[PDB]
Design an enzyme around this catalytic site. Structure first.
Site, PDB file in Angstrom:
ATOM      1  N   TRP A  82      28.314  47.152  38.804  1.00 55.40           N
ATOM      2  CA  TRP A  82      27.442  45.987  38.708  1.00 55.40           C
ATOM      3  C   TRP A  82      26.385  46.087  39.794  1.00 55.40           C
ATOM      4  CZ3 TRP A  82      28.205  40.738  41.311  1.00 55.40           C
ATOM      5  CH2 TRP A  82      27.455  39.731  40.687  1.00 55.40           C
ATOM      6  N   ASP A 138      37.370  42.876  41.835  1.00 49.66           N
ATOM      7  CA  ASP A 138      36.395  42.008  41.182  1.00 49.66           C
ATOM      8  C   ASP A 138      36.924  41.780  39.769  1.00 49.66           C
ATOM      9  OD1 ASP A 138      34.301  40.953  39.662  1.00 49.66           O
ATOM     10  OD2 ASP A 138      32.748  42.081  40.743  1.00 49.66           O
ATOM     11  N   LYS A 166      32.797  33.578  32.546  1.00 49.81           N
ATOM     12  CA  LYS A 166      32.730  34.164  31.213  1.00 49.81           C
ATOM     13  C   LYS A 166      33.909  33.775  30.333  1.00 49.81           C
ATOM     14  CE  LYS A 166      29.976  37.446  33.588  1.00 49.81           C
ATOM     15  NZ  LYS A 166      30.118  38.459  34.663  1.00 49.81           N
TER      16      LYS A 166
END
Ligand SMILES: *Cc1c(COP(=O)(O)O)cnc(C)c1O
Ligand SMILES: *Cc1c(COP(=O)(O)O)cnc(C)c1O
EC number: 2.6.1.1
Lengths: 399, 399
Positions: free
Chosen positions: A133, A214, A249
């Site tokens: 990311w 993460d 999300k």
């Protein structure tokens, strides 16, 4: 006087969030958005989940105050988060080795961990997958930490290059932080197997790394419990680790900024001592976290009838993505792609590394109004039955 | 291996927010909370404003998505903020010299300014009043900025020691930041007069300071427009300034983290360039801001009918606090205080800076269950007709 802002240099736009701006300004009615990682439904909208709307209505009619939360947020939010990560009966929980702060998103959790490490430990370096990311490097550099890359993706075979990963990580020292995506690697969608996770966990304790997970996509690969298998194999072996999780999300709560930073230490006394400095770092950043989104999460996870609605809504999102992956690959061949794109079926989550070049991605935007990230990352959850054919006609035209 | 968290030193509890935990654990019947700066009504509760409940119902009915906001948040929120700060017809707005980012609370706005300054300017030093809000030093130190103190309060006369303030800022250099409270100085409740503000505005331009305003109580001193006179005298003369503002207290939205960081530069091109670096600093912290609280504020300020309700609710809060100040002084006298507390009537905002010592504050806590900040700051907005007599009896006893 000379003026303090006069000589500031302009910052480049964000490779992801800048696309939103470009996409809005485009006046062509056929434009297609495959950039930012939000979920779209069959009609091309980003809806509010039914479970969330029901929880918000409950809060509206029963909230009596907006008085400050504690620095670490809503207690029930923390308890529910630890159960999701580690499982209802975890020894990490029974032994009181974990502490959780509610944070503003998973990004906020990443920055809190980073500040906490930079100011209270001897950590100097964070190891991040190549690719990862793009905001990982910015977060850790901003806290003062060096960022190094370990090998991950074999671009010729569209697979995880495990031997290369291990070889490149032999350079990480004891006391270095190594960052792993818990599932649905962003951007490749290629995750380790359970066997590979177990190998990495064993190597991690042997080398003395501090694992940082993460975890932004729990539920989008196989399931809530399945997607946490890798993290739990680490938690069974390690004295210390950190998890930065996001509910943006898997709850569709993106703009309410709902995440958690969870700290694990060898024992209760040590984790409480460390967490007192994590609280101090939060106080000096945003003081205390936003209630609305976290209250929604805690309301849903605490209520059996609401949780069941949510779990089904999450399964529906996971399965729609799976249907689009298959439809994408089949339609590419029907539109005259002579390249094999079957590797897309083997990838997990929202994102596929499509193999398109920067120049091809630029052509798609300028000539066809199709918006993808410059790295070739495409958001499969932006695909719908109605836009699949124009999307694939556009890709074939630039191959 | 050794362990990354073993050398960590525990942090002490926050001197303000830690009070909640101490108050909650106290089992003495009749305990009284005069600590953290939230508004209480006559019943001792911290209510949601009616205007806010109305706005939250509108949002529940009309929100169709939770998709991420832009890095700088809701555009209308920024516009409404600038009008509130600078005035509807301000030259700063017409010349497009101001850019505003929505932030998580005023604390988030201070932190974003700190990070932006540390990484993009040659600012190395921030000057803050002695006394000030204790979190000021922590926020600026978190970005690596040196914090110095200037003199402010005459503890003998309970007034602004203006001559000492001027003299103590003699060594603040061009390019140093000087922090001012916009109104309702926290903790003293003593604000410059308009003439004093004007004197400071001219000195600041002559010396080349960069002013930073912390504006957390707009509307609690005299009124929304009147409380901004000081800021507006600075804005009329400076090419550059920063405003960190909060809606936690004047909208009662504490736990939703609604604030704003406003950048002012000499012209539009400069502020846009600087602002792009502020956005980069936000992206690497918490990515983008929480929507719910700022949507409430933008909704109320944009609707004449809701705004009129809110404005009356703010007036109501201000008036109750003023009545409690008078009752506090009167009841201390009738309970037999020989010390003259009439200076408390001259203080603005939620607090009374009482002159009690740390030892007297601890005794109030341990002996009477009355909870104040160890600086002697007492929250008048936590006083009620029902708790005033016991409170005053307890104070008189430790004098
Ligand atoms: C989405 C994402 C984040 C950030 O989550 P937020 O809650 O929006 O801050 C961090 N890491 C990865 C890998 C992500 O996909
Ligand atoms: C309340 C306050 C703040 C912080 O406000 P939040 O919106 O809660 O972050 C900052 N400065 C002063 C002077 C305050 O009184």
């Amino acid at each position: 006087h000379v003026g303090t802002f006069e000589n500031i240099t302009a910052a480049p736009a964000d490779p992801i969030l800048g696309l939103a701006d470009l996409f809005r300004a485009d006046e062509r009615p056929g434009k297609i958005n495959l950039g930012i990682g939000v979920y779209f439904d069959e009609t091309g909208k980003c809806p509010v989940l039914t479970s969330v709307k029901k929880a918000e209505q409950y809060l509206l009619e029963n909230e009596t105050t907006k008085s400050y939360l504690g620095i670490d947020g809503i207690p029930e939010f923390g308890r529910c988060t630890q159960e999701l990560l580690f499982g209802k009966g975890s020894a990490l929980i029974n032994d009181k080795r974990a502490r959780t702060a509610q944070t503003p998103g998973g990004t906020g959790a990443l920055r809190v961990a980073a500040d906490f490490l930079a100011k209270n430990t001897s950590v100097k370096r964070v190891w991040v997958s190549n690719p990862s990311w793009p905001n990982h490097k910015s977060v850790f550099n901003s806290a003062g930490l060096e960022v190094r890359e370990y090998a991950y993706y074999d671009a010729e075979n569209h697979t995880l290059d495990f031997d290369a990963l291990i070889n490149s990580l032999n350079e990480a020292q004891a006391g270095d932080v190594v960052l792993f995506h818990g599932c649905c690697h962003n951007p490749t969608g290629i995750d380790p197997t359970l066997e590979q996770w177990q190998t990495l966990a064993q190597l991690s304790v042997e080398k003395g790394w501090l694992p940082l997970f993460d975890f932004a996509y729990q539920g989008f690969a196989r399931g809530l419990e399945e997607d946490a298998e890798g993290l739990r194999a680490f938690a069974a072996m390690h004295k210390e680790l950190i998890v930065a999780s996001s509910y943006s999300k898997n709850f569709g709560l993106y703009n309410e900024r709902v995440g958690a930073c969870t700290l694990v230490a060898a024992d209760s006394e040590t984790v409480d001592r460390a967490f007192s400095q994590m609280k101090a770092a939060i106080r000096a950043n945003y003081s205390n976290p936003p209630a609305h989104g976290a209250s929604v999460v805690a309301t849903i996870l605490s209520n059996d009838a609401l949780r069941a609605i949510w779990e089904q809504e999450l399964t529906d999102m996971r399965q729609r993505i799976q249907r689009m992956r298959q439809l994408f690959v089949n339609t590419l061949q029907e539109k005259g792609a002579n390249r094999d794109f079957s590797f897309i079926i083997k990838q997990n989550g929202m994102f596929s590394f499509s193999g398109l070049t920067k120049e091809q991605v630029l052509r798609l935007r300028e000539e066809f109004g199709v918006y993808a990230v410059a790295s070739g990352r495409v958001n499969v959850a932006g695909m719908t039955p109605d836009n699949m054919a124009p999307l694939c006609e556009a890709i074939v035209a630039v191959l």
